[PDB]
Amino acid sequence: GHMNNLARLEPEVLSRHAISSEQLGIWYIQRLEPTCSAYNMVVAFDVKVNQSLGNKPIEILEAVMHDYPLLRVSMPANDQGIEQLIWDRVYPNIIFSDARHIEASDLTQLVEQDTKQPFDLTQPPLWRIHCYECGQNHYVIAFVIHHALMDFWSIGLLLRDVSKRFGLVAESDAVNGIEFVQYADKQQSSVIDDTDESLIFWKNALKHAPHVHSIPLDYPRPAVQQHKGSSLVFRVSESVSSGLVNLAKDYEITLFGLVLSGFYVLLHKLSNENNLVIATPVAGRLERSLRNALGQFVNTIAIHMDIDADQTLRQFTQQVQEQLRQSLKHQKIAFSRVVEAVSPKRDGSINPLAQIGMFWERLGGMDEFKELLLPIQTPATLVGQDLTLGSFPVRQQEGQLDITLEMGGEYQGELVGVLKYNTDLFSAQSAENMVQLLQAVLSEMVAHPERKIVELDIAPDYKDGIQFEALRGKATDYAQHDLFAMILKQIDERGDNHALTSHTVSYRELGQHIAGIAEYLRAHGITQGDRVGLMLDRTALLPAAILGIWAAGAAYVPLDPNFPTERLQNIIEDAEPKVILTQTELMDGLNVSVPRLDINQAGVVALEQVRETLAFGDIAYVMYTSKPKGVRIGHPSIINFLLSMNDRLQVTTETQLLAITTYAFDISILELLIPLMYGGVVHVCPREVSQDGIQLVDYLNAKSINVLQATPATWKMLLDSEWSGNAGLTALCGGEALDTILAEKLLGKVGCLWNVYGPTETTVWSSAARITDAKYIDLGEPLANTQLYVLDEQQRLVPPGVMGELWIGGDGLAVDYWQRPELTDAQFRTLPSLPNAGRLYRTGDKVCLRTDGRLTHHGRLDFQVKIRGFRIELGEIENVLKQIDGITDAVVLVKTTGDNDQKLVAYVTGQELDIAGLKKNLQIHLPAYMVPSAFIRLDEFPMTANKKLDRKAFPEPIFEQSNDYVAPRDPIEIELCTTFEQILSVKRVGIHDDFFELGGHSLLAVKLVNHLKKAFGTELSVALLAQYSTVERLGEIIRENKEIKPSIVIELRRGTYEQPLWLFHPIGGSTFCYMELSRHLNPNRTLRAIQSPGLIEADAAEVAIEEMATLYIAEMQKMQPQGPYFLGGWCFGGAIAYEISRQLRQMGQQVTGIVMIDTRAPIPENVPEDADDAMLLSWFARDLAAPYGKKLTIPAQYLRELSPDQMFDHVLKEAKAINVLPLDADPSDFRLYFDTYLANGIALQTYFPEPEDFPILLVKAKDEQEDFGESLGWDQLVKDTLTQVDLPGDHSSIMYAENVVAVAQTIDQMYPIP
Ligand SMILES: CCCCCCCCCCCCCC(=O)OC[C@H](COP(=O)(O)OCC[N+](C)(C)C)OC(=O)CCCCCCCCCCCCC
Ligand SMILES: [K+]
């Protein structure tokens, strides 16, 4: 409309060509994900014009389109592959918008969103021009060209030429816009045999490559790649930029080589992996003939480096330059051909073989355009008589890979780069971080050339000896406070108010018990520093026992009496306690050589009589943890902890806390004490109540609780017990990781949620996160006088975004491990690399220092998250499983198998589950590499005594080592199997064989899908095949569409001989029985088989053989109009063939011969006995299973006891139970098959042809028990022209693999073909 002067008159195709291998990969990706814009190349300009421009843009447009045939190309697909068509003319797609009213920021965004509109590569043109008016005579013009059509080198050729036509540059080399076709067509003649030296090179270079890199992501990887990306432009300082150039000269290497080396070093530091792959596009125009040619010539190569951290940067840089040099020798091999040869596991979440890229592009002979083509704004212009070009930067080609580094440009001394990153994996903050780290590697390279890759520290120099200021907790005097005095004050003040709920104990009464228990212990030998075993039931005496023991100056050792006796004995022996303080009932419980004291015998004593006596000792307790380790905790740590916790909890008089945690778990310390410090109430929860969800829901609703701390296990128990929630309740969750699912459930049930963390060695908790949103979970903020550090294996502070060991410093630290000084000395140290951080504790926990400043937990360095060369985030798998309806919990582990091989196992619990159903679900929701190899149902996940998941105690999995051959079960699976077989050249394909594992690859998938579209009458995508890639899975998808219309002809083999062999269905109406036969027939003979229409449309089965034959003959004459004909059938198929022959004579066609395999002649003697409906079903059930070598025996007598509907359900259910029908077959499906069966029966029952001679081969199953005569009765129909051959097998088994080979041979020897 801004462009009336064109008119659309309708185009014709000039010529048809092949696409190149360099085009195939891009093309494929665009079909695979049609909303993809990642390959939309965009060059854009500010354009200011003078009036003398006139009509030149349209005139020049028309001239260019005419001169360069490439610009008139489309790339449609057929079943023989992918083509390029040159159209005689294309209507240009030129969009023109008013942008006078739009702010600059917004205008950029507009143009970015406009140019990302996707192309359909099958419909021309494959390029667009987007125009925007910005003011009078002032425009922005953006040219968009899909990379499947041409590369950037081509852009420059085109840019320079069109600029000359416009009067902007003085001269331009001639451009060839027709050579791309010759190139592609010649390439189609070439072979590239599996024996090619270049192909072998790549096959070896990438054999040990990991499936995926192990760079920590900010988000979980989506199951199917969406090609969303973003871009971060950076600049290298002029200092370093110069250094790099000089450092390049100080080696053999190129500048490209140097920066690539820097990039590997970077990814090595970020992932701590030695095996890294980086993709690098090459220009691809080695022949001088191709320098001026438009087209897509760029080829990806994958460089897999094995990093040796011991190498110096000099040495390693040289190592890369050399592997680069060798690799460029073999660059002729297309990336798609390399992926075909290496044959990695196809996975829709990642680009195959490489997910990291580096492009280094500098065009030559484009000096005038240098600054215009940079990714930054520049005031430089190109001024012509009629117009003026200026910069206009546009984000473009985003989301090709996980990460792409783009370099090559320079401005005012500084190298200019663009880091492109996938925004479903990385945050903007992480991109910024990667750039800052690259900056660092490059700097450290020029400054210290000889430094070893391990010795190299990329980390920022941290200012006040910490990674983030958040990681240092508030400095306070809390550790110098007096816990006892605080509690005494509350006793003196709170008086007769409640303190403990078992009957209720007042604060005054509590003080009396403290005193009486302290005096009991003193009076019986307990002195300051002694260790006192504590073996109690959860009563109100429990808090009092703790404080009593403390007041006598002793430390307690928790001996929870519900724990197993062997465990308690091991503690007794290591701790060597002075006495065991227990209760009456338990005095004889353990046979131990240690004095016992009954706490009930302790008097009650007025506090005023023994307060002069009472004072805490140095050590508060020895808490045992998994050989037994006793962690000795001092009272300064405890009070530091408690006070720190109070800042967050603000405990008051109205506080009512439900204590549920065993006192043999240190976290119980918080539950049993902190309300007593402030005048509130401790509800000591009986153990039987806290292990029963319904009983705990009732205790909660009753006692008006407002603080509850518990491990996830307990919280899960509560939510799974229909708990109503409390909006005034403050919840604490600790001991194990908090998953997002539990978090959201909790957030809607409680008023405040803390995720809280810390090893026993740094006193209960050490960090704490106020969780407000389930999407944002971390270890949170450090407590008072606590410092968190994330270290590597050399104990240096890691860079942000990197994983390491969490070390903890400050006032929380334990005194030691009880009488284990060497262990104590190794786990509690000061470090030279942190000389001001004091004593620190080594947690053995794996933690990530986020770019955010947050810490996330991945914990326990000792566990192998490492699989086939990469690492897994097990919890992401666990989250997807928990989101299934039915599933209640899930745990995923890595286990070892056979050789040095690792596999994933998923354990699940729930009220109602389907295991195969799980596999299917995760496959569509997870990246392929995160889908478990085994699924095990459990009733109850094994717990520890602390109430944590006991991962060591899950039963070991027994992995399937192979997948069972299963034959296709209905017409849909028969058609897919034959199609898989035929297209892959695999003899026999089972419904669980994977297309790509069987040797299939991306081009084949395009061919396959285009065939399936024709065969079924519907639209399928390569996306559907990628994700449903077994016959079973794809068959379920196709089966869902009730509007599919299969042909009744299935082509089992396309041969090279003129005459096909036609095969006709037996009684059941299906072609299944000819598949195995077809595998052994001479492959040069076309074979076609005909199923009954009855199998696809209701009531469509013919009931008269005469009518059946006419119908089929018409179907035959569409593919083979004239004879001679060649016909055959197994069983009843033979009889159809006979009648078809009889009719072909009548119309003058000749019959070459008939193949009849154990066909009972159509004569009265051979008609089956009369059957009632039950018997017919019983027969049908049997004849359903026999083609698969299975007996299915449903006695007629059993069926007669049921209603007719029950009958059909019973047979359907049974047939499924032995896998001769699909599980998703419904009763109506079953009616089609039974009705077809009945129809053929009636047809048989009414067919009695007069004798007629045809040339016949009758193959008789010689082991068939049932007597039908020497010739199955054919001696009464055929006189002179019948040849008989007796072969092993019975009426069914003659067609099974073992016996059917001899049948094929007989057919081939009787009816030879040249
Ligand atoms: C993919 C390869 C294709 C190569 C084709 C060559 C480029 C041809 C430019 C096509 C743009 C034509 C669209 C167009 O008509 O734009 C309209 C504007 C304003 O026109 P309008 O306001 O309609 O003027 C009417 C004047 N009247 C009534 C008195 C006749 O007029 C303009 O804004 C014209 C701006 C021209 C910018 C030329 C820039 C040259 C470098 C291009 C290099 C790109 C190759 C990669
Ligand atoms: K620019």
PDB file of N, CA and C in Angstrom, residues 460-507:
ATOM      1  N   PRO A 460      37.147 -12.739  41.798  1.00  0.00           N
ATOM      2  CA  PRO A 460      37.393 -11.331  42.128  1.00  0.00           C
ATOM      3  C   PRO A 460      38.221 -11.255  43.399  1.00  0.00           C
ATOM      4  N   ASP A 461      39.057 -10.240  43.568  1.00  0.00           N
ATOM      5  CA  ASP A 461      39.788 -10.127  44.823  1.00  0.00           C
ATOM      6  C   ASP A 461      38.819  -9.576  45.865  1.00  0.00           C
ATOM      7  N   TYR A 462      38.406 -10.441  46.784  1.00  0.00           N
ATOM      8  CA  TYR A 462      37.376 -10.107  47.751  1.00  0.00           C
ATOM      9  C   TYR A 462      37.905  -9.184  48.829  1.00  0.00           C
ATOM     10  N   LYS A 463      37.169  -8.105  49.087  1.00  0.00           N
ATOM     11  CA  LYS A 463      37.665  -6.976  49.882  1.00  0.00           C
ATOM     12  C   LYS A 463      37.950  -7.321  51.347  1.00  0.00           C
ATOM     13  N   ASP A 464      36.894  -7.490  52.140  1.00  0.00           N
ATOM     14  CA  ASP A 464      37.055  -7.748  53.568  1.00  0.00           C
ATOM     15  C   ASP A 464      37.080  -9.234  53.884  1.00  0.00           C
ATOM     16  N   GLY A 465      37.863  -9.993  53.123  1.00  0.00           N
ATOM     17  CA  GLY A 465      38.000 -11.422  53.353  1.00  0.00           C
ATOM     18  C   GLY A 465      36.689 -12.194  53.408  1.00  0.00           C
ATOM     19  N   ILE A 466      35.754 -11.843  52.527  1.00  0.00           N
ATOM     20  CA  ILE A 466      34.510 -12.593  52.343  1.00  0.00           C
ATOM     21  C   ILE A 466      33.943 -12.362  50.939  1.00  0.00           C
ATOM     22  N   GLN A 467      33.169 -13.324  50.453  1.00  0.00           N
ATOM     23  CA  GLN A 467      32.653 -13.299  49.091  1.00  0.00           C
ATOM     24  C   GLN A 467      31.510 -12.310  48.878  1.00  0.00           C
ATOM     25  N   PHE A 468      30.634 -12.177  49.868  1.00  0.00           N
ATOM     26  CA  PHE A 468      29.563 -11.174  49.857  1.00  0.00           C
ATOM     27  C   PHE A 468      29.351 -10.687  51.280  1.00  0.00           C
ATOM     28  N   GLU A 469      28.919  -9.448  51.464  1.00  0.00           N
ATOM     29  CA  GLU A 469      28.779  -8.964  52.832  1.00  0.00           C
ATOM     30  C   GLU A 469      27.586  -9.649  53.530  1.00  0.00           C
ATOM     31  N   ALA A 470      26.641 -10.146  52.744  1.00  0.00           N
ATOM     32  CA  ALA A 470      25.510 -10.885  53.294  1.00  0.00           C
ATOM     33  C   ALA A 470      25.970 -12.134  54.036  1.00  0.00           C
ATOM     34  N   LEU A 471      27.049 -12.745  53.547  1.00  0.00           N
ATOM     35  CA  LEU A 471      27.569 -14.003  54.092  1.00  0.00           C
ATOM     36  C   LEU A 471      28.261 -13.870  55.455  1.00  0.00           C
ATOM     37  N   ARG A 472      28.473 -12.633  55.893  1.00  0.00           N
ATOM     38  CA  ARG A 472      28.989 -12.371  57.230  1.00  0.00           C
ATOM     39  C   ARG A 472      27.853 -11.944  58.132  1.00  0.00           C
ATOM     40  N   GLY A 473      27.653 -12.694  59.212  1.00  0.00           N
ATOM     41  CA  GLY A 473      26.581 -12.405  60.142  1.00  0.00           C
ATOM     42  C   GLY A 473      26.927 -11.323  61.143  1.00  0.00           C
ATOM     43  N   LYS A 474      25.893 -10.596  61.564  1.00  0.00           N
ATOM     44  CA  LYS A 474      25.973  -9.544  62.577  1.00  0.00           C
ATOM     45  C   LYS A 474      26.943  -9.878  63.718  1.00  0.00           C
ATOM     46  N   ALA A 475      27.852  -8.956  64.023  1.00  0.00           N
ATOM     47  CA  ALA A 475      28.751  -9.125  65.159  1.00  0.00           C
ATOM     48  C   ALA A 475      28.085  -8.652  66.455  1.00  0.00           C
ATOM     49  N   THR A 476      27.985  -9.551  67.430  1.00  0.00           N
ATOM     50  CA  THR A 476      27.345  -9.255  68.710  1.00  0.00           C
ATOM     51  C   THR A 476      28.094  -9.925  69.863  1.00  0.00           C
ATOM     52  N   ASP A 477      27.724  -9.569  71.091  1.00  0.00           N
ATOM     53  CA  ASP A 477      28.285 -10.192  72.290  1.00  0.00           C
ATOM     54  C   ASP A 477      27.425 -11.351  72.824  1.00  0.00           C
ATOM     55  N   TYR A 478      26.604 -11.948  71.960  1.00  0.00           N
ATOM     56  CA  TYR A 478      25.658 -12.978  72.377  1.00  0.00           C
ATOM     57  C   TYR A 478      26.328 -14.163  73.067  1.00  0.00           C
ATOM     58  N   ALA A 479      27.504 -14.554  72.593  1.00  0.00           N
ATOM     59  CA  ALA A 479      28.174 -15.724  73.152  1.00  0.00           C
ATOM     60  C   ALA A 479      28.688 -15.490  74.576  1.00  0.00           C
ATOM     61  N   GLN A 480      28.553 -14.268  75.082  1.00  0.00           N
ATOM     62  CA  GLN A 480      29.045 -13.947  76.422  1.00  0.00           C
ATOM     63  C   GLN A 480      27.901 -13.848  77.421  1.00  0.00           C
ATOM     64  N   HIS A 481      26.679 -13.985  76.913  1.00  0.00           N
ATOM     65  CA  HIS A 481      25.487 -13.981  77.752  1.00  0.00           C
ATOM     66  C   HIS A 481      25.331 -15.238  78.595  1.00  0.00           C
ATOM     67  N   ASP A 482      24.382 -15.159  79.523  1.00  0.00           N
ATOM     68  CA  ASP A 482      24.164 -16.163  80.553  1.00  0.00           C
ATOM     69  C   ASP A 482      22.777 -16.782  80.414  1.00  0.00           C
ATOM     70  N   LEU A 483      22.721 -17.947  79.781  1.00  0.00           N
ATOM     71  CA  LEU A 483      21.461 -18.632  79.562  1.00  0.00           C
ATOM     72  C   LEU A 483      20.723 -18.930  80.862  1.00  0.00           C
ATOM     73  N   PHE A 484      21.451 -19.381  81.880  1.00  0.00           N
ATOM     74  CA  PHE A 484      20.830 -19.798  83.141  1.00  0.00           C
ATOM     75  C   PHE A 484      20.126 -18.634  83.823  1.00  0.00           C
ATOM     76  N   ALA A 485      20.812 -17.502  83.879  1.00  0.00           N
ATOM     77  CA  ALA A 485      20.279 -16.306  84.517  1.00  0.00           C
ATOM     78  C   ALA A 485      18.977 -15.874  83.849  1.00  0.00           C
ATOM     79  N   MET A 486      18.933 -15.974  82.525  1.00  0.00           N
ATOM     80  CA  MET A 486      17.741 -15.637  81.765  1.00  0.00           C
ATOM     81  C   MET A 486      16.548 -16.498  82.170  1.00  0.00           C
ATOM     82  N   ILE A 487      16.787 -17.796  82.338  1.00  0.00           N
ATOM     83  CA  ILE A 487      15.724 -18.723  82.703  1.00  0.00           C
ATOM     84  C   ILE A 487      15.316 -18.554  84.160  1.00  0.00           C
ATOM     85  N   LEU A 488      16.286 -18.328  85.036  1.00  0.00           N
ATOM     86  CA  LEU A 488      15.965 -18.022  86.427  1.00  0.00           C
ATOM     87  C   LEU A 488      15.077 -16.768  86.553  1.00  0.00           C
ATOM     88  N   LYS A 489      15.393 -15.718  85.793  1.00  0.00           N
ATOM     89  CA  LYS A 489      14.579 -14.505  85.796  1.00  0.00           C
ATOM     90  C   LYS A 489      13.131 -14.835  85.435  1.00  0.00           C
ATOM     91  N   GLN A 490      12.953 -15.617  84.374  1.00  0.00           N
ATOM     92  CA  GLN A 490      11.619 -16.034  83.952  1.00  0.00           C
ATOM     93  C   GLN A 490      10.901 -16.860  85.018  1.00  0.00           C
ATOM     94  N   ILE A 491      11.630 -17.712  85.722  1.00  0.00           N
ATOM     95  CA  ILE A 491      11.039 -18.435  86.846  1.00  0.00           C
ATOM     96  C   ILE A 491      10.570 -17.483  87.962  1.00  0.00           C
ATOM     97  N   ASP A 492      11.431 -16.553  88.372  1.00  0.00           N
ATOM     98  CA  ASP A 492      11.093 -15.616  89.449  1.00  0.00           C
ATOM     99  C   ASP A 492       9.937 -14.695  89.070  1.00  0.00           C
ATOM    100  N   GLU A 493       9.845 -14.359  87.785  1.00  0.00           N
ATOM    101  CA  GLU A 493       8.822 -13.433  87.299  1.00  0.00           C
ATOM    102  C   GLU A 493       7.512 -14.115  86.914  1.00  0.00           C
ATOM    103  N   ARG A 494       7.600 -15.201  86.153  1.00  0.00           N
ATOM    104  CA  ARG A 494       6.398 -15.870  85.654  1.00  0.00           C
ATOM    105  C   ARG A 494       5.617 -16.605  86.751  1.00  0.00           C
ATOM    106  N   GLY A 495       6.282 -16.900  87.869  1.00  0.00           N
ATOM    107  CA  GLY A 495       5.630 -17.471  89.040  1.00  0.00           C
ATOM    108  C   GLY A 495       4.840 -18.752  88.816  1.00  0.00           C
ATOM    109  N   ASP A 496       3.511 -18.644  88.866  1.00  0.00           N
ATOM    110  CA  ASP A 496       2.637 -19.817  88.794  1.00  0.00           C
ATOM    111  C   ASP A 496       2.012 -20.029  87.410  1.00  0.00           C
ATOM    112  N   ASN A 497       2.382 -19.177  86.458  1.00  0.00           N
ATOM    113  CA  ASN A 497       2.000 -19.382  85.066  1.00  0.00           C
ATOM    114  C   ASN A 497       2.552 -20.685  84.508  1.00  0.00           C
ATOM    115  N   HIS A 498       1.918 -21.170  83.442  1.00  0.00           N
ATOM    116  CA  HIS A 498       2.327 -22.413  82.793  1.00  0.00           C
ATOM    117  C   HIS A 498       3.705 -22.311  82.142  1.00  0.00           C
ATOM    118  N   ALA A 499       4.455 -23.405  82.207  1.00  0.00           N
ATOM    119  CA  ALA A 499       5.768 -23.496  81.594  1.00  0.00           C
ATOM    120  C   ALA A 499       5.869 -24.749  80.715  1.00  0.00           C
ATOM    121  N   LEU A 500       5.412 -25.885  81.237  1.00  0.00           N
ATOM    122  CA  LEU A 500       5.504 -27.155  80.519  1.00  0.00           C
ATOM    123  C   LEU A 500       4.178 -27.927  80.488  1.00  0.00           C
ATOM    124  N   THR A 501       3.792 -28.419  79.309  1.00  0.00           N
ATOM    125  CA  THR A 501       2.601 -29.262  79.183  1.00  0.00           C
ATOM    126  C   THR A 501       2.958 -30.678  78.777  1.00  0.00           C
ATOM    127  N   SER A 502       2.697 -31.621  79.672  1.00  0.00           N
ATOM    128  CA  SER A 502       3.069 -33.007  79.449  1.00  0.00           C
ATOM    129  C   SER A 502       2.214 -33.638  78.354  1.00  0.00           C
ATOM    130  N   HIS A 503       0.035 -33.792  82.877  1.00  0.00           N
ATOM    131  CA  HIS A 503      -0.439 -32.627  83.615  1.00  0.00           C
ATOM    132  C   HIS A 503       0.601 -31.496  83.634  1.00  0.00           C
ATOM    133  N   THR A 504       0.104 -30.266  83.776  1.00  0.00           N
ATOM    134  CA  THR A 504       0.865 -29.026  83.586  1.00  0.00           C
ATOM    135  C   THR A 504       1.817 -28.647  84.723  1.00  0.00           C
ATOM    136  N   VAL A 505       3.012 -28.190  84.351  1.00  0.00           N
ATOM    137  CA  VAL A 505       4.027 -27.720  85.295  1.00  0.00           C
ATOM    138  C   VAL A 505       4.186 -26.208  85.245  1.00  0.00           C
ATOM    139  N   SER A 506       4.021 -25.527  86.376  1.00  0.00           N
ATOM    140  CA  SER A 506       4.228 -24.080  86.409  1.00  0.00           C
ATOM    141  C   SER A 506       5.720 -23.711  86.411  1.00  0.00           C
ATOM    142  N   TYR A 507       6.025 -22.436  86.185  1.00  0.00           N
ATOM    143  CA  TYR A 507       7.407 -21.967  86.247  1.00  0.00           C
ATOM    144  C   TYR A 507       8.049 -22.139  87.636  1.00  0.00           C
TER     145      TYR A 507
END
